Design an enzyme around this catalytic site. Structure first.
Site, mmCIF file in Angstrom:
data_model
loop_
_atom_site.group_PDB
_atom_site.id
_atom_site.type_symbol
_atom_site.label_atom_id
_atom_site.label_comp_id
_atom_site.label_asym_id
_atom_site.label_seq_id
_atom_site.Cartn_x
_atom_site.Cartn_y
_atom_site.Cartn_z
ATOM 1 N N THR A 1 0.827 -1.027 0.059
ATOM 2 C CA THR A 1 0.050 0.215 0.044
ATOM 3 C C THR A 1 0.866 1.273 -0.061
ATOM 4 O O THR A 1 0.859 2.003 -1.019
ATOM 5 C CB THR A 1 -0.939 0.067 1.349
ATOM 6 O OG1 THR A 1 -0.989 -1.472 1.869
ATOM 7 C CG2 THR A 1 -2.076 0.846 0.943
ATOM 8 N N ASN B 1 5.423 -1.429 4.007
ATOM 9 C CA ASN B 1 4.436 -0.922 4.973
ATOM 10 C C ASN B 1 5.123 -1.025 6.380
ATOM 11 O O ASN B 1 4.408 -0.328 7.171
ATOM 12 C CB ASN B 1 3.189 -1.966 4.930
ATOM 13 C CG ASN B 1 2.245 -1.567 3.655
ATOM 14 O OD1 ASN B 1 2.491 -0.574 3.228
ATOM 15 N ND2 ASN B 1 1.330 -2.293 3.649
ATOM 16 N N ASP C 1 -9.533 -3.498 -1.461
ATOM 17 C CA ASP C 1 -8.443 -4.028 -0.685
ATOM 18 C C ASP C 1 -9.137 -4.827 0.779
ATOM 19 O O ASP C 1 -8.805 -5.852 1.150
ATOM 20 C CB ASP C 1 -7.325 -3.158 -0.326
ATOM 21 C CG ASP C 1 -6.235 -3.761 0.512
ATOM 22 O OD1 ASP C 1 -5.418 -4.292 -0.198
ATOM 23 O OD2 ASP C 1 -6.146 -3.765 1.739
ATOM 24 N N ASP D 1 -3.539 1.012 -6.472
ATOM 25 C CA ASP D 1 -2.008 0.965 -6.318
ATOM 26 C C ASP D 1 -1.513 -0.393 -6.399
ATOM 27 O O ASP D 1 -0.387 -0.520 -6.595
ATOM 28 C CB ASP D 1 -1.963 1.215 -4.635
ATOM 29 C CG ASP D 1 -3.096 0.518 -3.716
ATOM 30 O OD1 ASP D 1 -3.770 -0.278 -3.968
ATOM 31 O OD2 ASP D 1 -2.989 0.956 -2.634
ATOM 32 N N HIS E 1 -1.150 -9.265 -1.063
ATOM 33 C CA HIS E 1 -0.601 -8.833 -2.250
ATOM 34 C C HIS E 1 1.024 -8.443 -1.568
ATOM 35 O O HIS E 1 1.060 -8.394 -0.291
ATOM 36 C CB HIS E 1 -0.986 -7.469 -2.583
ATOM 37 C CG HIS E 1 -1.656 -6.451 -1.445
ATOM 38 N ND1 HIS E 1 -0.759 -5.660 -1.019
ATOM 39 C CD2 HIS E 1 -2.721 -6.330 -0.949
ATOM 40 C CE1 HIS E 1 -1.213 -4.936 -0.289
ATOM 41 N NE2 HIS E 1 -2.560 -5.415 0.070
HETATM 42 C C1 LIG Z 1 -3.450 8.075 -4.253
HETATM 43 O O1 LIG Z 1 -4.171 9.402 -3.815
HETATM 44 C C2 LIG Z 1 -4.712 9.446 -2.882
HETATM 45 C C3 LIG Z 1 -4.350 8.601 -1.846
HETATM 46 O O2 LIG Z 1 -2.881 9.027 -1.242
HETATM 47 C C4 LIG Z 1 -2.596 8.478 -0.109
HETATM 48 C C5 LIG Z 1 -3.500 8.099 0.722
HETATM 49 C C6 LIG Z 1 -3.021 7.542 2.039
HETATM 50 C C7 LIG Z 1 -3.846 6.901 3.011
HETATM 51 O O3 LIG Z 1 -4.683 7.589 3.589
HETATM 52 N N1 LIG Z 1 -3.936 5.608 3.566
HETATM 53 C C8 LIG Z 1 -4.724 5.046 4.796
HETATM 54 C C9 LIG Z 1 -4.129 3.821 5.099
HETATM 55 C C10 LIG Z 1 -2.701 3.798 5.871
HETATM 56 C C11 LIG Z 1 -2.561 2.789 6.958
HETATM 57 N N2 LIG Z 1 -2.632 1.373 6.073
HETATM 58 C C12 LIG Z 1 -3.365 0.545 6.450
HETATM 59 O O4 LIG Z 1 -3.836 0.397 7.643
HETATM 60 C C13 LIG Z 1 -3.421 -0.569 5.539
HETATM 61 C C14 LIG Z 1 -4.028 -0.625 4.513
HETATM 62 C C15 LIG Z 1 -4.184 -1.832 3.480
HETATM 63 C C16 LIG Z 1 -3.556 -2.728 3.487
HETATM 64 N N3 LIG Z 1 -3.275 -4.030 2.775
HETATM 65 N N4 LIG Z 1 -2.199 -4.742 3.468
HETATM 66 N N5 LIG Z 1 -1.903 -4.127 4.659
HETATM 67 C C17 LIG Z 1 -2.338 -2.813 4.709
HETATM 68 C C18 LIG Z 1 -2.341 -2.025 5.622
HETATM 69 C C19 LIG Z 1 -1.812 1.707 4.907
HETATM 70 C C20 LIG Z 1 -1.864 3.218 4.487
HETATM 71 C C21 LIG Z 1 -3.342 3.440 3.689
HETATM 72 C C22 LIG Z 1 -3.167 4.499 2.848
HETATM 73 N N6 LIG Z 1 -1.526 7.529 2.203
HETATM 74 C C23 LIG Z 1 -0.717 7.943 1.311
HETATM 75 C C24 LIG Z 1 0.551 8.056 1.667
HETATM 76 C C25 LIG Z 1 1.655 8.604 0.611
HETATM 77 C C26 LIG Z 1 0.994 8.830 -0.504
HETATM 78 C C27 LIG Z 1 -0.447 9.139 -0.876
HETATM 79 C C28 LIG Z 1 -1.153 8.330 0.192
HETATM 80 CL CL LIG Z 2 6.758 -4.484 3.997
HETATM 81 ZN ZN LIG Z 3 -4.106 -4.766 1.454
#
Ligand SMILES: COCCOc1cc(C(=O)N2C[C@@H]3[C@H]4CN(C(=O)c5ccc6[nH]nnc6c5)C[C@H]4[C@@H]3C2)nc2ccccc12
Ligand SMILES: [Cl-]
Ligand SMILES: [Zn+2]
Ligand SMILES: *[C@@H]1O[C@H](CO)[C@@H](O[C@@H]2O[C@H](CO)[C@@H](O[C@@H]3O[C@H](CO[C@H]4O[C@H](CO)[C@@H](O)[C@H](O[C@H]5O[C@H](CO)[C@@H](O)[C@H](O)[C@@H]5O[C@H]5O[C@H](CO)[C@@H](O)[C@H](O)[C@@H]5O)[C@@H]4O)[C@@H](O)[C@H](O[C@H]4O[C@H](CO)[C@@H](O)[C@H](O)[C@@H]4O[C@H]4O[C@H](CO)[C@@H](O)[C@H](O)[C@@H]4O)[C@@H]3O)[C@H](O)[C@H]2NC(C)=O)[C@H](O)[C@H]1NC(C)=O
Ligand SMILES: [Ca+2]
Ligand SMILES: [K+]
Ligand code: NA
Length: 806
Positions: free
Chosen positions: A159, A180, A261, A308, A420
């Site tokens: 992610t 991550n 996801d 992503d 993934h």
């Molecule tokens: C891309 O356009 C809008 C979104 O942009 C962004 C949104 C976000 C943004 O707000 N997030 C919220 C969630 C954070 C914590 N997280 C999880 O809890 C998670 C999620 C899915 C998973 N699959 N496997 N393990 C996992 C763990 C991963 C990150 C996800 C991205 N962060 C960003 C950080 C850097 C750049 C962009 C960002």
């Molecule tokens: Cl990792």
């Molecule tokens: Zn995931």
């Protein structure tokens, strides 16, 4: 400390973040436990839901409602997204025929089409076809706009690395978000999904698009949404921002969905439970598009719908445990799951040894579902090594599997059915791209491309100069109607010398021998012609490569091949030759087995010598132009020139000889001729970039002959295979590889078998883009073609993946 006693009155979803301990009202305050006391009441209204109904039409404005259906709502910018449909007889955007958007149609006051990035987590590329029935809004964006069959994510396919790559155009090794979860030994600090360390700016390298925009005077909506803010509220906030006065309104926005996801991990990528999440995301797209239509922005804004990474079937039972391989499992720390990263549990432990760990993990079980690598030996296409946060030892995990340290980790940490993170070539990890709006093309399909390319395009869409990044700017020009970026080819820095015959055979004291002293103006005229470049048009089809750094090198011509020979590295930087469909393979004649011949165009002082190879008990040699493909018995002598020789470990010669003797002719038969360019690569500091001479860690024993870390080949032919590679009128087709030059074949568990059972599989794993070879060599290829430069840029970014059909 946060003094939450202040108020969000009139500040709801304010664009500038106020600094502690004053309380916050921005879309991230929840995440920081910092919102003002009245943030929920004022900023997260839910009353009456998200949809206008017939009876609310024309209602008295009640400021308590989540959204409005009163007459003043349009000018206030806060109607429910379905207002004009329910109350004013309008159609939903999805029900309208698509009509080409030739020019932006924007309200007055708009200086540029805004860009909205709609990002979906875990949205697998095949959902576009497989879920098409339940996603009408998304299908209309896809069919009416510009779309790729899939978009390739970066490795690891997690992610944070991919979202930040989307925002920066950088590989994770350069932007610093390499998983991550991460440990940085210089900071002595750990980045985790949960907790505050991940908010610290020191983790986040490069320059993401919101910063690029802000620095160049283009305002940006925030990209981050606290998880508890509902999607409907996110969309309504974007729409409200789009009604701000001109001087205050952002030009770039992002929406983020945690679906599909979230459900995919629970149910697997195609679990029957997955249909509802797809429908809900499509409804959210519909809300946005209806909202834009209300605002007269639906033929003004460029919308990118992008994911992503994808999602694979992975279950608890498909886990490999290091405790089945290692005796010392308690002396290591493992980052586990769909990739593995190993380091010492304690830096004070002098008995920890990476070599013995790797060996205990190598080809130990017949169906073993991961492969260990020192990070510098990973396929160069992953670009996953030059960062101190990437542990020296890496496990590449097979698709559908996990690796863990001990069984107790999997049950005292089945739950999950999807995950993934695997190699970014894997079909299940591919994701989506659609661009829709005045700046994108109409009803256009584009080939698959990598997500590192998108930052440059997002910059083009907003008229921004991109920060330096790993995209190749211009390679996605074919996605755009306007705002294309028209680069010029880089200037050649070093011009070649063209040496004629300048040395007598007896000046050379190289310890080389050849049985070649067996002896006509009919054929002596002809060989002089060949040495002066008379067959060069046949073997150098796209111009000679340009040398983009300062060095000393010679062009050498021959009947069957041309080379750029480095006087500094004592070997070719590149060797170019064409093999027609009709070409025949011959053997190395017995009398010529050990033949090496001085090259009378090149000084003894700038040549390799055979004695160094004899004395170096580990190192042997191979040739860049293969003697097996010589056009005639007499032309074959050219192949044994000292200037065509390169150092090769015997284990690697197995690989190389099979490529040269068997595979090249196979490709020429399949592709209707091929043009081959081959050469060495020196990347001892694993930075993906050509080494200078003082970076070389290994020489052939007792000599100044540098040992390559890799050998490349670029194999080009006509995209229309009815035309032969050397008479091609139109677009090209290319496949390339960057093979690691290793002293064993431990990477290939079947290497005791005949090369026909394992070599091509290794080569496929080490598939590369032409651009990867450019970075590694400081060469620029395809300088003289009939093709547009942007088309050539796209060709240089192509990666032949060898996966079946998506
Ligand atoms: C891309 O356009 C809008 C979104 O942009 C962004 C949104 C976000 C943004 O707000 N997030 C919220 C969630 C954070 C914590 N997280 C999880 O809890 C998670 C999620 C899915 C998973 N699959 N496997 N393990 C996992 C763990 C991963 C990150 C996800 C991205 N962060 C960003 C950080 C850097 C750049 C962009 C960002
Ligand atoms: Cl990792
Ligand atoms: Zn995931
Ligand atoms: C993909 O695209 C990217 C972006 O274009 C390419 O990366 C660039 O490559 C350049 C060459 O490797 C590199 O240029 C160097 O910059 C040094 C200054 O760097 C700082 O400032 C920039 C600009 O704002 C900034 O972006 C940098 O950010 C890096 O570092 C911080 C960590 O502090 C991270 O948060 C961030 O993620 C990023 O890290 C990444 O790059 C660094 C290297 O900078 C890696 O170490 C990390 O692992 C990670 O990958 C910095 O904050 C500048 O000081 C360098 O100059 C030195 O070396 C040259 C040799 O040519 C010499 O001329 C100079 O005199 C100087 O030498 C002295 O220092 C040496 C080392 O300390 C020492 O040995 C000598 O004896 C001397 O004392 C150099 O110009 C540029 O920084 C990165 N940019 C980014 C964002 O990564 C990348 O190559 C592309 N990849 C491919 C495959 O094509
Ligand atoms: Ca290097
Ligand atoms: K030897
Ligand atoms: Na092996």
């Amino acid at each position: 400390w946060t003094a939450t006693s202040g108020s969000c009155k009139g500040r709801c979803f304010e664009l500038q973040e106020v600094g502690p301990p004053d309380c916050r009202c921005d879309n991230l305050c929840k995440s920081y436990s910092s919102c003002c006391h009245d943030f929920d009441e004022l900023c997260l209204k839910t009353a009456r839901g998200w949809e206008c109904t017939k009876d609310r039409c024309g209602e008295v404005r009640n400021e308590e409602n989540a959204c409005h259906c009163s007459e003043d709502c349009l000018s206030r910018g806060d109607c429910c997204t379905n207002y004009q449909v329910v109350c004013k007889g309008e159609s939903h955007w999805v029900d309208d025929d698509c009509e080409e958007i030739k020019v932006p149609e924007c309200p007055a006051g708009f200086v540029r089409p805004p860009l909205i990035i709609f990002s979906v987590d875990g949205f697998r590329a095949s959902y576009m076809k497989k879920g098409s029935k339940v996603m009408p809004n998304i299908e209309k964006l896809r069919s009416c706009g510009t779309h790729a069959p899939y978009m390739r994510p970066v490795y690891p396919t997690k992610t944070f690395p991919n979202l930040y790559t989307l925002a920066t155009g950088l590989y994770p090794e350069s932007h610093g978000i390499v998983g991550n979860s991460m440990y940085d030994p210089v900071f002595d600090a750990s980045f985790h999904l949960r907790g505050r360390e991940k908010f610290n700016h020191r983790w986040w390298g490069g320059q993401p698009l919101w910063i690029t925009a802000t620095k160049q005077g283009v305002r940006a909506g925030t990209f981050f949404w606290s998880v508890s803010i509902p999607h409907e509220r996110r969309i309504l906030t974007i729409l409200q921002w789009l009604s701000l006065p001109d001087n205050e309104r952002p030009s770039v926005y992002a929406f983020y969905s945690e679906q599909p996801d979230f459900s995919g991990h629970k149910y697997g990528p195609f679990g029957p439970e997955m249909t509802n999440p797809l429908r809900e995301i499509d409804k959210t797209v519909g809300q946005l598009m209806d909202g834009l239509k209300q605002l007269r922005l639906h033929r003004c804004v460029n919308v990118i719908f992008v994911g992503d990474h994808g999602m694979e079937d992975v279950t608890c039972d498909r886990t490999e445990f290091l405790s089945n391989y290692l005796t010392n499992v308690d002396d290591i720390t493992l980052v586990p799951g769909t990739l593995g990263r190993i380091r010492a549990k304690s830096i004070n432990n002098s008995k920890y040894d990476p070599k013995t760990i790797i060996a205990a993990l190598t080809c130990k079980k017949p169906d073993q579902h991961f492969k260990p690598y020192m990070k510098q030996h990973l396929p160069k296409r992953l670009h996953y090594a030059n960062n101190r946060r990437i542990e020296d030892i890496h496990l590449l995990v097979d698709r559908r599997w996990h690796v863990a340290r001990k069984p107790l980790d999997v049950y005292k940490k089945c739950f999950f059915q999807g995950d993934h993170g695997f190699d970014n070539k894997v079909n299940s990890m591919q994701t989506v791209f659609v661009g829709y709006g005045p700046t994108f093309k109409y009803r256009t399909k584009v080939p698959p491309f990598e997500n590192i390319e998108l930052y440059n395009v997002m910059c083009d869409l907003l008229g921004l100069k991109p920060a330096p990044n790993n995209g190749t700017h211009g390679s996605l020009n074919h996605l755009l109607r306007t705002n294309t970026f028209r680069p010029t080819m880089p200037d050649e820095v070093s011009r070649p010398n063209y040496p004629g015959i300048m040395y007598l055979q007896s000046e050379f004291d190289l310890g080389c021998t050849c049985d070649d002293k067996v002896e006509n103006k009919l054929e002596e005229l002809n060989k002089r012609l060949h040495t002066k470049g008379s067959t060069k048009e046949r073997h150098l089809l796209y111009g000679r490569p340009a040398v983009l750094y300062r060095t000393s090198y010679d062009i050498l011509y021959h009947t069957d091949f041309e080379s750029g020979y480095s006087e500094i590295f004592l070997m070719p930087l590149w060797t170019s030759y064409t093999i027609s469909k009709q070409a025949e393979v011959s053997s190395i004649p017995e009398h010529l087995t050990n033949c090496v011949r001085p090259d009378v165009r090149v000084s003894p002082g700038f040549s390799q010598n055979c004695l160094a190879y004899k004395n170096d008990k580990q190192m042997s040699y191979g040739f860049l132009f293969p003697p097996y493909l010589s056009s005639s018995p007499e032309a074959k002598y050219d192949a044994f020139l000292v200037t065509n020789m390169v150092p090769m470990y015997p284990a690697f010669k197995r690989v190389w000889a099979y490529f040269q003797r068997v595979l090249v002719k196979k490709y020429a038969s399949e592709r209707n001729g091929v043009n081959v360019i081959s050469g060495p690569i020196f990347d001892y500091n694993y930075d993906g970039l050509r080494d200078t001479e003082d970076e070389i860690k290994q020489y052939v024993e007792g000599s100044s002959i540098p040992v390559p870390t890799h050998y490349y080949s670029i194999i080009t032919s006509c995209l229309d295979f009815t035309q032969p590679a050397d008479k091609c009128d139109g677009p090209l087709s290319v496949s390339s590889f960057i093979l690691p030059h290793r002293p064993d074949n431990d990477e290939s568990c079947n290497s005791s078998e005949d090369e026909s059972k394992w070599v091509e599989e290794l080569m496929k794993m080490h598939t590369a883009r032409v651009r990867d070879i450019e970075h590694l060599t400081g060469l620029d290829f395809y300088r003289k073609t009939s093709r547009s430069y942007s088309e050539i840029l796209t060709l240089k970014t192509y990666l032949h993946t060898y996966e079946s059909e998506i």
